Amino acid sequence: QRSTLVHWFRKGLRLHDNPALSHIFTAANAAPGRYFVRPIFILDPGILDWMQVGANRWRFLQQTLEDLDNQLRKLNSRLFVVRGKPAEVFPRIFKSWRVEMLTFETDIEPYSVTRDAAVQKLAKAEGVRVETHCSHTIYNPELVIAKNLGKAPITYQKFLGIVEQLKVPKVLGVPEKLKNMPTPPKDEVEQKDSAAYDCPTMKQLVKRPEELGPNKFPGGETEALRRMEESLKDEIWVARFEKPNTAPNSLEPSTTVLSPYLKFGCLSARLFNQKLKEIIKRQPKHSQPPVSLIGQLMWREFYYTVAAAEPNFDRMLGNVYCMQIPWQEHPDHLEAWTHGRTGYPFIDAIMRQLRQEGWIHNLARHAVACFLTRGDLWISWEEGQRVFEQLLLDQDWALNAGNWMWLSASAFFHQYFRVYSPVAFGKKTDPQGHYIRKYVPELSKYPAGCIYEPWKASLVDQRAYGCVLGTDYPHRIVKHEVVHKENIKRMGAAYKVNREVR
DNA sequence: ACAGCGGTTGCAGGT
DNA sequence: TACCTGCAACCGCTG
Ligand SMILES: Cc1cc2nc3c(=O)[nH]c(=O)nc-3n(C[C@H](O)[C@H](O)[C@H](O)COP(=O)(O)OP(=O)(O)OC[C@H]3O[C@@H](n4cnc5c(N)ncnc54)[C@H](O)[C@@H]3O)c2cc1C
Numbered sequence: 024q025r026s027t028l029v030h031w032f033r034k035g036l037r038l039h040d041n042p043a044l045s046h047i048f049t050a051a052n053a054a055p056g057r058y059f060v061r062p063i064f065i066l067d068p069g070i071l072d073w074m075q076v077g078a079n080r081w082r083f084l085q086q087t088l089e090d091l092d093n094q095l096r097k098l099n100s101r102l103f104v105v106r107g108k109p110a111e112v113f114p115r116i117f118k119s120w121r122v123e124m125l126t127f128e129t130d131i132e133p134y135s136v137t138r139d140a141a142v143q144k145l146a147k148a149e150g151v152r153v154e155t156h157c158s159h160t161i162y163n164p165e166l167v168i169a170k171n172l173g174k175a176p177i178t179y180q181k182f183l184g185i186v187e188q189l190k191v192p193k194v195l196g197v198p199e200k201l202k203n204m205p206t207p208p209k210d211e212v213e214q215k216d217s218a219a220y221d222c223p224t225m226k227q228l229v230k231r232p233e234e235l236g237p238n239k240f241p242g243g244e245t246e247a248l249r250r251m252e253e254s255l256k257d258e259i260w261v262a263r264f265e266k267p268n269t270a271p272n273s274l275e276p277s278t279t280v281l282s283p284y285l286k287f288g289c290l291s292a293r294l295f296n297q298k299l300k301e302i303i304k305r306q307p308k309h310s311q312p313p314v315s316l317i318g319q320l321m322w323r324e325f326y327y328t329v330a331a332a333e334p335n336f337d338r339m340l341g342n343v344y345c346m347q348i349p350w351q352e353h354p355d356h357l358e359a360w361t362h363g364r365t366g367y368p369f370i371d372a373i374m375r376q377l378r379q380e381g382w383i384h385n386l387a388r389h390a391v392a393c394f395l396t397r398g399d400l401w402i403s404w405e406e407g408q409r410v411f412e413q414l415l416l417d418q419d420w421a422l423n424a425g426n427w428m429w430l431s432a433s434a435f436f437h438q439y440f441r442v443y444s445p446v447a448f449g450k451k452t453d454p455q456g457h458y459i460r461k462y463v464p465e466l467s468k469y470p471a472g473c474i475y476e477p478w479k480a481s482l483v484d485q486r487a488y489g490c491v492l493g494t495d496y497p498h499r500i501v502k503h504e505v506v507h508k509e510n511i512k513r514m515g516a517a518y519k520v521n522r523e524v525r
Numbered sequence: 526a527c528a529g530c531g532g533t534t535g536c537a538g539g540t
Numbered sequence: 541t542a543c544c545t546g547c548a549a550c551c552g553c554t555g
């Protein structure tokens with residue numbers, strides 16, 4: 024018959040390096056038998072208005088919550104998956120559980136800002152102590168903004184100068200095994216259903232299981248650490264890691280693929296940073312930022328900082344960084360790009376892997392992002408943002424929007440002369456086109472001399488490869504060698520228009 | 526002041 | 541091999 028401490032999961036679905044969670048566990052064990060602990064995850068049915076979520080990411084979260092519960096079970100506790108909106112949920116669970124303190128990890132995203140504010144205001148009303156922690160990113164965006172005179176650095180090299188003169192926080196371990204902690208007595212919901220706050224099953228979470236692809240990347244903290252240690256095994260590979268040197272179209276990932284685990288917070292970026300630093304010190308010949316592996320982690324930190332200031336970071340209108348470009352509507356060309364039926368086998372192969380597996384390589388994301396926007400189709404990056412938002416396992420509001428602005432040359436990147444060739448780009452790393460053959464099996468019998476460009480081969484040859492254009496594989500919707508030059512001139516025109524105002 | 530430099534990852538043609 | 545200059549040219553940051 025006592026008060027309750029609460030940790031609230033949103034991002035940071037881990038035990039390791041969770042100062043918000045450890046602060047609960049250390050305090051509860053400081054006064055044993057005086058508290059109840061409720062590690063909660065609010066299954067908010069309001070994020071659906073905020074973001075598109077595909078089947079693949081729902082599977083990831085299902086596996087994450089299942090692992091988080093298993094990890095919490097070993098600490099004499101458990102997870103509580105509460106259904107309903109926080110604005111409705113909190114008032115009830117504050118009184119019924121009798122909550123004294125509530126902790127959670129901070130998030131810059133607009134949905135959280137309005138949510139975290141409304142929660143903390145109500146906490147002040149109900150006499151609930153709230154102390155938040157900043158552990159999703161290595162550096163606090165506000166402090167970076169502050170030390171750069173109340174504004175965010177709009178270049179990478181300037182950003183590096185601001186962050187290097189800041190203290191790197193202590194990476195924490197796993198919280199203590201709860202001493203003298205019985206199961207909290209069943210509330211109004213738990214009495215009416217014992218399994219009310221249990222982990223949502225696949226059926227409960229994934230509404231359309233036919234959209235699910237192969238489960239190549241299982242969710243959870245356990246897999247995150249496991250995959251990290253596997254990636255850090257070859258220290259030679261880690262040290263000399265240079266991003267442009269990595270292939271976009273290799274069958275098995277040329278990079279670590281820790282981004283989904285960093286997005287959900289199954290892996291601590293601080294720990295990953297700390298682990299990388301240690302290897303660097305044991306390796307003489309090592310790569311330096313931005314191309315380095317730590318540099319890649321710094322890019323995450325970079326996009327998180329600029330987005331912290333601008334709430335309209337995901338849209339063109341009202342965005343302080345985004346170049347105002349008259350993008351054209353074309354639902355026909357949009358539907359084709361979204362489902363990988365453009366007629367460009369390299370672009371289609373990437374988009375099909377994105378739909379099926381839920382992850383694609385950085386330079387593979389580059390090729391498609393350029394093609395849709397300033398490259399060929401001249402379609403707004405906001406459209407491709409939603410496609411990525413739905414299909415990506417690592418869908419990060421800040422990272423998704425920022426990198427889309429990079430490739431559309433709306434912000435940060437400005438050299439619109441550098442346009443990716445959907446025909447040539449893939450050839451360098453994959454001359455045979457194995458990647459195309461796997462994800463576009465229609466063209467698997469085509470020779471390497473015209474697999475990136477089927478329109479080059481005669482009809483009599485098309486029949487001989489068991490794939491005729493127009494039926495078995497769509498005609499190329501636009502002509503790259505023509506459209507990209509016209510788009511270059513369009514980019515220069517809009518670059519003047521924005522320059523005029525300033 | 527305007528002007529040189531650097532900018533995660535262009536392409537084609539060349540050595 | 542890994543880097544050579546054309547292409548006609550952007551932005552922010554620097555002194
Ligand atoms: C149009 C577009 C949209 C993108 N959307 C997302 C997204 O929503 N979420 C996301 O995590 N990444 C996004 N990326 C960035 C990048 O493609 C991925 O982070 C990377 O390919 C994931 O593979 P990895 O984990 O092996 O990265 P690694 O090469 O292993 O890099 C290490 C870590 O650094 C981070 N990182 C790498 N590249 C970037 C970068 N370009 N910007 C910011 N952080 C980076 C990732 O979290 C990654 O886990 C996007 C890129 C483009 C071009």
Ligand SMILES: O=c1nc2n(C[C@H](O)[C@H](O)[C@H](O)CO)c3cc(O)ccc3cc-2c(=O)[nH]1
Nearest residue numbers: 033034065066067070076084130132134135
């Ligand atoms: O608080 C929650 N946040 C959820 N978010 C997590 C989200 O990243 C954080 O809540 C952010 O802090 C919101 O801006 C999700 C994100 C996804 O990409 C996919 C599914 C979810 C589900 C939830 C959820 O149920 N509850």
